[PDB]
mmCIF file of C-alpha atoms in Angstrom:
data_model
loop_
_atom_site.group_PDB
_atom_site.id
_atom_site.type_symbol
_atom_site.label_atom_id
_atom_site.label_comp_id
_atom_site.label_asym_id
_atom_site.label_seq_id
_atom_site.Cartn_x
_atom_site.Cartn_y
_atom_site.Cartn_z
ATOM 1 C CA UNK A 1 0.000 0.000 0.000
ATOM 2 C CA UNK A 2 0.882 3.595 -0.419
ATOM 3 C CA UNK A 3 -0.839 5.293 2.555
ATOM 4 C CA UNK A 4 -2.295 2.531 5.607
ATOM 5 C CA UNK A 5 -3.542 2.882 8.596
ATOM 6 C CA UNK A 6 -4.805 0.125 10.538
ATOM 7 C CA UNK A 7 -5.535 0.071 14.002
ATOM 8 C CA UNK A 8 -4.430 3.548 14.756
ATOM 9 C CA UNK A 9 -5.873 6.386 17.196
ATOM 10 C CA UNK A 10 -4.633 10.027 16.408
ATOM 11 C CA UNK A 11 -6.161 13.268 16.569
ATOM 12 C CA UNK A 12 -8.032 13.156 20.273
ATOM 13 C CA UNK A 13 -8.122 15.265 22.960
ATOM 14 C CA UNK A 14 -9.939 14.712 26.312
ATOM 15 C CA UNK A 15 -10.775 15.858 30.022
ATOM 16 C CA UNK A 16 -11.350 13.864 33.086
ATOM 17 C CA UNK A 17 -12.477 15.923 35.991
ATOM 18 C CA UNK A 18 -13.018 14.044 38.700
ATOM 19 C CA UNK A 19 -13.686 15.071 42.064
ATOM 20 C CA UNK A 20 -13.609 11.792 43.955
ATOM 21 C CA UNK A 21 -12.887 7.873 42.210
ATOM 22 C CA UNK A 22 -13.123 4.785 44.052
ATOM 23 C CA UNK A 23 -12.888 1.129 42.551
ATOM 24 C CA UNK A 24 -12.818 -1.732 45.470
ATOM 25 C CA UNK A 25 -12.816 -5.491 43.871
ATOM 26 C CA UNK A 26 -12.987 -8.695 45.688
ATOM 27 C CA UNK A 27 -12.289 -11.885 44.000
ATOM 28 C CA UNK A 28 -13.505 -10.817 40.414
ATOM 29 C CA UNK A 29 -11.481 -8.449 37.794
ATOM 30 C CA UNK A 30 -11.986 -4.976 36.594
ATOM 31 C CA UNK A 31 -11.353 -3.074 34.073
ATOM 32 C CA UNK A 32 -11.274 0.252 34.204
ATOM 33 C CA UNK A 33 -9.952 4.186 31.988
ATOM 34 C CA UNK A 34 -8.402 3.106 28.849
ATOM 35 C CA UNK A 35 -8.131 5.257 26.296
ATOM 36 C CA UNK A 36 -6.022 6.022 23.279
ATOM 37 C CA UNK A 37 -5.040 2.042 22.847
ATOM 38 C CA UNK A 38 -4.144 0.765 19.450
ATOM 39 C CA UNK A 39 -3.329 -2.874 18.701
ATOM 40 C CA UNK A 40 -3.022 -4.946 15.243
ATOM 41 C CA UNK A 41 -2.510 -8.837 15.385
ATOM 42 C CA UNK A 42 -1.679 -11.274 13.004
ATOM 43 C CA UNK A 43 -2.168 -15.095 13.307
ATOM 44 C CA UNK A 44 -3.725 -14.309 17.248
ATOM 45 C CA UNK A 45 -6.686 -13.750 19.921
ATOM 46 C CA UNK A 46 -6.220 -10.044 20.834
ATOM 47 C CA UNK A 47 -8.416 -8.422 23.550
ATOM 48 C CA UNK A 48 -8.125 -4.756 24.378
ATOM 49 C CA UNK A 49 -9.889 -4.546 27.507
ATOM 50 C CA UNK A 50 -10.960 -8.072 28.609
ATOM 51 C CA UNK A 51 -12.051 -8.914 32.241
ATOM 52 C CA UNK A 52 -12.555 -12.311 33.391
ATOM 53 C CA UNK A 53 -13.550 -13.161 36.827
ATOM 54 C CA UNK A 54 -12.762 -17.022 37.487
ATOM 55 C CA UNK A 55 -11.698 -19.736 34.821
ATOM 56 C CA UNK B 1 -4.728 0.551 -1.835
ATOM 57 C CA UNK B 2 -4.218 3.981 -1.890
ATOM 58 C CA UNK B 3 -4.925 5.669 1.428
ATOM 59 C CA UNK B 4 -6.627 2.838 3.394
ATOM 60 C CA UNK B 5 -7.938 3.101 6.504
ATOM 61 C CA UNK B 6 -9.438 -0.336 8.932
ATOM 62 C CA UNK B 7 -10.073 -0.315 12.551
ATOM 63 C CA UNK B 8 -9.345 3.816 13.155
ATOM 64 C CA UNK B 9 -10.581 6.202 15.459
ATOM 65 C CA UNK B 10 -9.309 9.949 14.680
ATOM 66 C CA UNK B 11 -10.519 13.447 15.596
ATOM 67 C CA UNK B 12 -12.022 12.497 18.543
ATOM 68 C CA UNK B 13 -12.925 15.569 21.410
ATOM 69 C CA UNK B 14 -14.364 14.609 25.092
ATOM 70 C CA UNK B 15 -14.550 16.183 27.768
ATOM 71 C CA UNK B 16 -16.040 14.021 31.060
ATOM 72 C CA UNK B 17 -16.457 15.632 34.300
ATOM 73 C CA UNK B 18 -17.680 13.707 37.139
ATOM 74 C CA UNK B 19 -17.957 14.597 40.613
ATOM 75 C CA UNK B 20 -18.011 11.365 42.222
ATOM 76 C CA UNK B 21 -17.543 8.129 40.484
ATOM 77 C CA UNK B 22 -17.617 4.623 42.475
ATOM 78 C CA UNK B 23 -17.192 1.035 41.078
ATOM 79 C CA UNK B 24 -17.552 -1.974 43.718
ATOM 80 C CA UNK B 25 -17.150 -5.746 42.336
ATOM 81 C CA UNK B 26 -17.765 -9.100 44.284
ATOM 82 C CA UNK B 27 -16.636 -11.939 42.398
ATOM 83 C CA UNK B 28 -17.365 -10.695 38.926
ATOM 84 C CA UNK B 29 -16.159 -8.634 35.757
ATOM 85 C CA UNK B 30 -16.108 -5.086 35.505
ATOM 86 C CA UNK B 31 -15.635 -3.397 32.214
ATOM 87 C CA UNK B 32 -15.581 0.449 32.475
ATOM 88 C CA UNK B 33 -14.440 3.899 30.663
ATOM 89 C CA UNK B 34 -13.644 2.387 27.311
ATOM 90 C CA UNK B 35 -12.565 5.268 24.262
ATOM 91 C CA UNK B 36 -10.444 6.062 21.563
ATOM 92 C CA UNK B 37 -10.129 2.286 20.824
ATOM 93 C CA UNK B 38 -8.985 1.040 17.764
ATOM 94 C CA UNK B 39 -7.919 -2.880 16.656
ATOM 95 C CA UNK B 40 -6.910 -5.134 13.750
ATOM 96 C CA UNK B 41 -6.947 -8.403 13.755
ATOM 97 C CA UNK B 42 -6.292 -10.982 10.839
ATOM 98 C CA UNK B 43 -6.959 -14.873 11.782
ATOM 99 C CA UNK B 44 -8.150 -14.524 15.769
ATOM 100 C CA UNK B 45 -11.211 -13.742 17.535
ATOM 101 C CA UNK B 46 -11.363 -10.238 18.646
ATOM 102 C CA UNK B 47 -12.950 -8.426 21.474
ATOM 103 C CA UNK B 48 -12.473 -4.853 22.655
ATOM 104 C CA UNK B 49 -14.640 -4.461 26.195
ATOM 105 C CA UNK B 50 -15.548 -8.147 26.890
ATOM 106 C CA UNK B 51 -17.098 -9.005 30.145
ATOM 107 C CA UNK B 52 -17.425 -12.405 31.509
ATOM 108 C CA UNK B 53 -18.621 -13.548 34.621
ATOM 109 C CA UNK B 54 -17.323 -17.353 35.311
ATOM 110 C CA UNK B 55 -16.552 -19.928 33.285
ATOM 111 C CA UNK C 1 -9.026 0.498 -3.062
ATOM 112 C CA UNK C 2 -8.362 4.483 -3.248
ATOM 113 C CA UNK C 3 -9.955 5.825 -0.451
ATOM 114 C CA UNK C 4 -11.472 3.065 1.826
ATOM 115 C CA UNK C 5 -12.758 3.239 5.286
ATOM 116 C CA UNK C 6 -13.480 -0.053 7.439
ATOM 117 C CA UNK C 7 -14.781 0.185 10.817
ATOM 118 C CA UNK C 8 -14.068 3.784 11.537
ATOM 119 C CA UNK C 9 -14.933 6.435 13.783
ATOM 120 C CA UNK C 10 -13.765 9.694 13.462
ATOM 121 C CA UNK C 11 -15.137 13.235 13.597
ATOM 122 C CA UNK C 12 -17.195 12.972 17.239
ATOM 123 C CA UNK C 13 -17.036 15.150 20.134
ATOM 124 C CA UNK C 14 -19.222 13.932 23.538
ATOM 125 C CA UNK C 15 -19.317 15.509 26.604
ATOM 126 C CA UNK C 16 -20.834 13.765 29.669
ATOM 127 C CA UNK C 17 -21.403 15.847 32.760
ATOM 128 C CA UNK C 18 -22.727 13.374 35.869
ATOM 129 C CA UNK C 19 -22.769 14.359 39.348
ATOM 130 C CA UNK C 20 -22.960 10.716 40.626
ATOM 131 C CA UNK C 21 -22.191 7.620 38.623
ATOM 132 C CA UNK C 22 -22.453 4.044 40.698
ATOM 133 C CA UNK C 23 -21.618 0.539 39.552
ATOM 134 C CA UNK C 24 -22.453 -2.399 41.701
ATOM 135 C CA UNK C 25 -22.075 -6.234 40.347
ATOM 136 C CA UNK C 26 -22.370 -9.486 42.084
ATOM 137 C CA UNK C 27 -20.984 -12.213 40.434
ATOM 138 C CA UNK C 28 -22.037 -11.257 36.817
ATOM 139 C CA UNK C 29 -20.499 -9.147 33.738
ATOM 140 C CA UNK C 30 -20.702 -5.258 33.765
ATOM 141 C CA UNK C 31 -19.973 -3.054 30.211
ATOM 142 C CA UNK C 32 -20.259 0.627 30.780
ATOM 143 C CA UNK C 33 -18.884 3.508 28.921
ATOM 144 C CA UNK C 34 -17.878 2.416 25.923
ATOM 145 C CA UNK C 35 -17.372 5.052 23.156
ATOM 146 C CA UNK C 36 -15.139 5.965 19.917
ATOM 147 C CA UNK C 37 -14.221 2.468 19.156
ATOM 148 C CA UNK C 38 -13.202 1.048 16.231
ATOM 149 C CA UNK C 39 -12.313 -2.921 14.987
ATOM 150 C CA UNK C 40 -11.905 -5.211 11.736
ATOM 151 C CA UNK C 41 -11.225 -8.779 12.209
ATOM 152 C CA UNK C 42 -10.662 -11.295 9.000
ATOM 153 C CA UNK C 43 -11.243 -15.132 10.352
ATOM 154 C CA UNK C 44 -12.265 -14.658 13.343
ATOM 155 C CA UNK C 45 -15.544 -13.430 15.706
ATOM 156 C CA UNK C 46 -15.461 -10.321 17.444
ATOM 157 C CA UNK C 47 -17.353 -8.735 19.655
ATOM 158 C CA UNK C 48 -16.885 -4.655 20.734
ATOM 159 C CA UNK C 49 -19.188 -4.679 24.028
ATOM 160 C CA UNK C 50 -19.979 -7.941 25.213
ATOM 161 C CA UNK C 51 -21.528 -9.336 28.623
ATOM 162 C CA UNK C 52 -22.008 -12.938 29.810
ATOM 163 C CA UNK C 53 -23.092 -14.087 33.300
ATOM 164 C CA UNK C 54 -21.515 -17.322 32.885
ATOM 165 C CA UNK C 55 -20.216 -20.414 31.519
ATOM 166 C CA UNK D 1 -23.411 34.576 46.901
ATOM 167 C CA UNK D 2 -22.399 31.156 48.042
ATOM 168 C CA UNK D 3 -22.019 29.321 44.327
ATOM 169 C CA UNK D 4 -21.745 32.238 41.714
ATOM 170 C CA UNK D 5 -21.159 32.147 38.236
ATOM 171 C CA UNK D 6 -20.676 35.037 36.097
ATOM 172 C CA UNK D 7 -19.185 35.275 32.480
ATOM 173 C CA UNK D 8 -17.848 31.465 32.107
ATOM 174 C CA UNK D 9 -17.803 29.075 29.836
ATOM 175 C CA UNK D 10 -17.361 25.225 31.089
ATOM 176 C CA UNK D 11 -17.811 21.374 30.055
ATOM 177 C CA UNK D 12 -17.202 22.252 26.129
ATOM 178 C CA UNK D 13 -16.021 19.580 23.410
ATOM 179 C CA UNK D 14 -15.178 20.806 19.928
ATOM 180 C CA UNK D 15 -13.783 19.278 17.084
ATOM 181 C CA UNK D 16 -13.201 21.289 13.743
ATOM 182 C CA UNK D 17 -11.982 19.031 10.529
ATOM 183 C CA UNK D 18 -11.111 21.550 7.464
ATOM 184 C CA UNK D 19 -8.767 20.323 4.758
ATOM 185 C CA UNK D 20 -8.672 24.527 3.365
ATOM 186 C CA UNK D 21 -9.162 27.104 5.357
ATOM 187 C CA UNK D 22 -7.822 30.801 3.768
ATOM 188 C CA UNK D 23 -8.387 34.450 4.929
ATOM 189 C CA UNK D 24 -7.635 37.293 2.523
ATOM 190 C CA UNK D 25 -7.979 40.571 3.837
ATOM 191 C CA UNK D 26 -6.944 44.413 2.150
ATOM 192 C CA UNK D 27 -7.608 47.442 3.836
ATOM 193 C CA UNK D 28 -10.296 45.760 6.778
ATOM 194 C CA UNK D 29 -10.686 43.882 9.609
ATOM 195 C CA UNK D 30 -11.352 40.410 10.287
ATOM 196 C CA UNK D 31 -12.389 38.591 13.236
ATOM 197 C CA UNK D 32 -12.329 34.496 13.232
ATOM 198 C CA UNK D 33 -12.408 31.246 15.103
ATOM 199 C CA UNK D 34 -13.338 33.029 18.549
ATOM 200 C CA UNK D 35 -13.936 29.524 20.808
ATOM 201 C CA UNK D 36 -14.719 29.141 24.749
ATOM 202 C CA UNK D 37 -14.029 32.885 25.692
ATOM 203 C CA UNK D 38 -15.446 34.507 28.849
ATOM 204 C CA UNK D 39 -15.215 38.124 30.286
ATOM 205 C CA UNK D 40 -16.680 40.226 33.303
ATOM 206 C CA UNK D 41 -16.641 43.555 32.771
ATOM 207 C CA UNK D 42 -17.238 46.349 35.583
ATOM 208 C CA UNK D 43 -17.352 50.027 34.624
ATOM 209 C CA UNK D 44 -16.389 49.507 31.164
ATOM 210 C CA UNK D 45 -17.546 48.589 27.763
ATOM 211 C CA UNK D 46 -16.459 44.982 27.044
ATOM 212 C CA UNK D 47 -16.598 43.897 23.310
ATOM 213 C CA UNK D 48 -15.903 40.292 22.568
ATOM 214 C CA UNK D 49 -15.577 39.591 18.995
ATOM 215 C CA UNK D 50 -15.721 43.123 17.295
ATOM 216 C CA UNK D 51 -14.351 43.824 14.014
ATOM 217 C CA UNK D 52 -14.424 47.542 12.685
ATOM 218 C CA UNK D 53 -13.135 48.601 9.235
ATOM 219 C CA UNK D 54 -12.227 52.603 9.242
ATOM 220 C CA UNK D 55 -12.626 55.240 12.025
ATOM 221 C CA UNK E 1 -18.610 34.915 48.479
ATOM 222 C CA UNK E 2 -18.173 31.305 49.436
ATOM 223 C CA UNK E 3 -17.780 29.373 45.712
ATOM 224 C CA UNK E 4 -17.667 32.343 43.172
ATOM 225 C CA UNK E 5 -15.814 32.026 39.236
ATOM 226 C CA UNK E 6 -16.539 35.117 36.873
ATOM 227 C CA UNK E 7 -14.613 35.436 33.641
ATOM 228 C CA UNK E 8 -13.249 31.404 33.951
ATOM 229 C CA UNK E 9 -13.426 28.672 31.303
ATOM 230 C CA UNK E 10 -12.655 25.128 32.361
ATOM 231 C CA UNK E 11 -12.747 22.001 31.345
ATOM 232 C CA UNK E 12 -12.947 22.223 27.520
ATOM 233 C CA UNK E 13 -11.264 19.977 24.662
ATOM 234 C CA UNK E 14 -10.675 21.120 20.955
ATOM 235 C CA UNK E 15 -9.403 18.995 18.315
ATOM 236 C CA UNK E 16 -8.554 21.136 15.223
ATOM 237 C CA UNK E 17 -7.027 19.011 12.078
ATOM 238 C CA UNK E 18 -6.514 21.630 9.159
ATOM 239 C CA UNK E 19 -3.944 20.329 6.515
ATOM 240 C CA UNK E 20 -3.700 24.041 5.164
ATOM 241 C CA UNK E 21 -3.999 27.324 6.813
ATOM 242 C CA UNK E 22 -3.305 30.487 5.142
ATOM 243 C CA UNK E 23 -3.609 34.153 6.373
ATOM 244 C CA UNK E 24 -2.672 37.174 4.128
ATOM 245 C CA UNK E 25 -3.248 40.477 4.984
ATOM 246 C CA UNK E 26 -2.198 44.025 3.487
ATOM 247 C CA UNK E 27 -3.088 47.279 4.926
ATOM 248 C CA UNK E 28 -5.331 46.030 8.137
ATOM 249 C CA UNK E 29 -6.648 43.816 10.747
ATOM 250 C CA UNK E 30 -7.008 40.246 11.520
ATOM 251 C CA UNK E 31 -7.601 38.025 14.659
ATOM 252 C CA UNK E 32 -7.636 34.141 14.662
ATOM 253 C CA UNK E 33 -7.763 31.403 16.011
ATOM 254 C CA UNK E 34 -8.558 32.641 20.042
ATOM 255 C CA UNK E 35 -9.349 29.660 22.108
ATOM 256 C CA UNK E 36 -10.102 29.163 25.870
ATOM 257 C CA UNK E 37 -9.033 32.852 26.803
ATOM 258 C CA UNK E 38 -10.630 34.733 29.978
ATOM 259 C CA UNK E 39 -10.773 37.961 31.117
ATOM 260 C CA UNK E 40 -11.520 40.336 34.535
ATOM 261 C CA UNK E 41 -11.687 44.179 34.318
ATOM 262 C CA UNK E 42 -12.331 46.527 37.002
ATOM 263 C CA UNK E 43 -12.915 50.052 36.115
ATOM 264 C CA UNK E 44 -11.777 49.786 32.390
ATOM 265 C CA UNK E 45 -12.681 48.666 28.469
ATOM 266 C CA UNK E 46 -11.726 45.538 27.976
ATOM 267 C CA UNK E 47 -12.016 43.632 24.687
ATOM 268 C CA UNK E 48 -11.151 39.674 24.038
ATOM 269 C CA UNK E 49 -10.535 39.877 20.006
ATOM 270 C CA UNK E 50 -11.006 43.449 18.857
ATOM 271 C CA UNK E 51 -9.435 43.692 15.098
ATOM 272 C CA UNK E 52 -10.031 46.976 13.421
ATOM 273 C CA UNK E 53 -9.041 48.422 10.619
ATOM 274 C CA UNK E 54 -7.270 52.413 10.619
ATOM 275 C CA UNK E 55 -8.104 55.445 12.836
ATOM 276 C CA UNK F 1 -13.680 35.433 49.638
ATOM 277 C CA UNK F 2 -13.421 31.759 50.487
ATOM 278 C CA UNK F 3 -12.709 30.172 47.133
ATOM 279 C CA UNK F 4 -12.972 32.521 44.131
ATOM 280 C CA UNK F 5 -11.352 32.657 40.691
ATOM 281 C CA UNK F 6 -11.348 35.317 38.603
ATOM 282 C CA UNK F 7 -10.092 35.508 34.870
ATOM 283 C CA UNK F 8 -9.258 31.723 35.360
ATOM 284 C CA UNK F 9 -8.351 28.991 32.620
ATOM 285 C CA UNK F 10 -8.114 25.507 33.578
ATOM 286 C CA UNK F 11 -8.410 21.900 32.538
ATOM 287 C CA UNK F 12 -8.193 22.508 28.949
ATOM 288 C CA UNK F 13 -7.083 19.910 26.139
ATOM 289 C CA UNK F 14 -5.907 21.064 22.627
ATOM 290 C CA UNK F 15 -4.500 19.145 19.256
ATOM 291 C CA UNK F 16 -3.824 20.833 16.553
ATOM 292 C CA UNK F 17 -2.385 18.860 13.316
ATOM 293 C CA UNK F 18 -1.916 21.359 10.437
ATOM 294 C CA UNK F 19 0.235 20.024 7.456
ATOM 295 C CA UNK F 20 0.879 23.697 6.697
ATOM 296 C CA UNK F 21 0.516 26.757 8.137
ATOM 297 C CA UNK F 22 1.050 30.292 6.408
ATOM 298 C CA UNK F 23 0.519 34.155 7.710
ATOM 299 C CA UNK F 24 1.950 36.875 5.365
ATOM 300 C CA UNK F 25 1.850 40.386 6.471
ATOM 301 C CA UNK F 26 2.027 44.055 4.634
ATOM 302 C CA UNK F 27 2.035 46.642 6.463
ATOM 303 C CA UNK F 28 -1.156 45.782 9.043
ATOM 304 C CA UNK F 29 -1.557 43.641 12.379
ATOM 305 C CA UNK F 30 -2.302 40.044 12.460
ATOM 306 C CA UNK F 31 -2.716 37.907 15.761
ATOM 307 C CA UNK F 32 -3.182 33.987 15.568
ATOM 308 C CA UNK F 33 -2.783 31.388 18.088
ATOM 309 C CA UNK F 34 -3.816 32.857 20.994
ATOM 310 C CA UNK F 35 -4.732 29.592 23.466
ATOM 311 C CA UNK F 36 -5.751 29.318 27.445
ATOM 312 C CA UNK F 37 -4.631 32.731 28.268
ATOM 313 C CA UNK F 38 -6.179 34.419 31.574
ATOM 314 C CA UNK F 39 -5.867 38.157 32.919
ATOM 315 C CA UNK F 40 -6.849 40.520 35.960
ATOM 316 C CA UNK F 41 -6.929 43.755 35.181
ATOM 317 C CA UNK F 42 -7.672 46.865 38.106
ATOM 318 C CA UNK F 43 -8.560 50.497 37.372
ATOM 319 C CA UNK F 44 -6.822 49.366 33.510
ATOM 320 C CA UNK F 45 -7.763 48.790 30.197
ATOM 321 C CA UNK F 46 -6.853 45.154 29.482
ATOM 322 C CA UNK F 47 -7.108 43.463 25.875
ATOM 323 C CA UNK F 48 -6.268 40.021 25.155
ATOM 324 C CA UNK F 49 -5.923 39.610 21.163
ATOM 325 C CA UNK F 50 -6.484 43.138 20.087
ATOM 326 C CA UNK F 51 -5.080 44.194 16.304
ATOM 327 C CA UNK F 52 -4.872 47.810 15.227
ATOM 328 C CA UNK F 53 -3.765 48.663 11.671
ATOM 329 C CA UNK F 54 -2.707 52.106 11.902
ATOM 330 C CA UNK F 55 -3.482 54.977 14.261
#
């Protein structure tokens, strides 16, 4: 290709005003504030933001 | 191709204010606060904000 | 292709003022928030926002 | 006052895409892109976005 | 007061992609571009973008 | 006061991608670019982006 983009994140601004953030977890998973994530797989199982509490 | 774009998030603004934000988990999944994401994947099973409780 | 777009998001601005915001799970699957996200997947299943109790 | 606003400007998102943007002036005035301003003014004259060719 | 803002701007987010920009002036005024820009006066004129031309 | 702000810029998020960017100038007054600027003026006049072409 001449020009490609794939999987990409450009161009973002943001704001998080928070007064007051709590997260309390007990015997799970959590997932929690991603942004701006970018990821390209070949020949693979990707997950960007994948919780899973027992197996 | 040319100019080729596939799995891109660009020019993206936001602006979040909270005051008071609170996440409690007891044996679970907790997914939360997911943006500007972007992925690519060739031969896999992909998942951006997957949740799962047991398995 | 010349000028292709696949699974894109771009040109968005969001703004989400909350006083309060509470999350509360008990052994199940919680999504929340997702936004400005953006996948392609070749062989494979995926799934952007996805919940499941269990197994 | 206990909570006072006066002249503000707050929880704003703005995104602006332009692939051309051209401003030819001779001889005037010209007044652009003005974006989240605020003003208090006592005892005066406040203008905010005020073009004026001659005098 | 107690909780008082005059002439503030918070919490704002600006995404601006422009692949060309061109100003050209002869012989006057010109104001761009302001962004997120506050202002108090006591006892005066104040002005936020004020082109003009001669006098 | 207790808490006060006055002429007050905060929690502000900018991008700016320009490929090019051109200002030409004969003889006049040009002002561009002018981002998250704050003032306090007392018994003053007090402009923020102000062009003039000739006096």
């Amino acid at each position: 290709g001449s020009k490609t983009k794939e999987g990409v994140v450009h161009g973002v601004a943001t704001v998080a005003e928070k007064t007051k953030e709590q997260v309390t977890n007990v015997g799970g998973a959590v997932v929690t504030g991603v942004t701006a994530v970018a990821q390209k797989t070949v020949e693979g199982a990707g997950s960007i933001a994948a919780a899973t509490g027992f197996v």
